[PDB]
Amino acid sequence: ASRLYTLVLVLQPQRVLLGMKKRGFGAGRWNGFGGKVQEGETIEDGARRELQEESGLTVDALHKVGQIVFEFVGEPELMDVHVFCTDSIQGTPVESDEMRPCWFQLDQIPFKDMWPDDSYWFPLLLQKKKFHGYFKFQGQDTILDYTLREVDTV
Ligand SMILES: CNc1cc(-c2cccc(Cl)c2Cl)nc(N)n1
């Protein structure tokens, strides 16, 4: 009962790229670049595609950094999110009708205007740790329960 998603963070030594989603699920929050994996696409090819479509950047190497399952109470389908990270990109970020990318200094990550789970796992991503997480949500603002652990292999 799970649907595959990817999420990609462009993380450089002193800054990270986030996008403000303007419409759809997650609108009004800053997040990485991501979406549903398509038929006939590998997860990693999905991640490259999402990044390229939503940010305008061309990515070279992608690195697996985590897997997070999200459950929304009342909704049958779980989100199975494969998280990736890259510091090897070409192009400049592009704002579109769907998404406004912005660079953030690592000391000014806008946690209060991100999904609340990011407060837990983003610091692990920043310190180059790999993780497996589960978050149970009620609606879009409230984490009822979660688990999060560091792993050697995603
Ligand atoms: C429910 N918590 C979430 C949900 C999501 C999310 C929402 C829409 C699309 C995609 Cl690909 C993702 Cl990963 N992202 C974060 N950081 N947290």
Between CA 146 and CA 133 the distance in angstroms is: 7
Residue 103 host element (H or E): strand 99-105
Q: Are 37 and 49 in contact (CB under 8 A)?
A: no
CA distance 16 to 125: 11
Indicate which technique resolved this structure: X-ray
Q: Number of folded domains in the chain? A: 1
Q: For ligand 1, pick from 37, 79, 80 the residue to mutate: most ligand atoms within 8 Å of CB.
A: 79
Q: Are 56 and 91 spatial neighbours (Cβ–Cβ below 8 Å)?
A: yes
Distance CA 123, CA 20 (A): 19
The domain that contains 98 carries what CATH number?
Answer: 3.90.79.10
Contact 9, 84 (CB under 8 A): yes
Contact 34, 5 (CB under 8 A): yes
Among residues 30, 41, 35, which one has the least CA distance to residue 53? 35
The HSE-up count of residue 98 (CA atoms within 13 Å, CB side) is 12
Q: Are 103 and 38 in contact (CB under 8 A)?
A: no
What resolution in angstroms does the PDB record give? Answer: 1.6
A 10 A CB-CB count for 107 gives: 6
Report the SS3 class of residue 83: strand
Please tell me the distance from the alpha carbon of residue 152 to that of residue 65, in angstroms, as a whole number: 10
- Is 31 marked within a binding site? yes
Residue-range definition of the domain harbouring residue 151: 1-154
> Rounded to 10 degrees, what is the CA torsion of 142, 31, 43, 57?
170
In 10 A of CB 7, how many CB atoms? 22
Residue to mutate (ligand 1; options 2, 5, 67; most atoms within 8 A of CB): 5
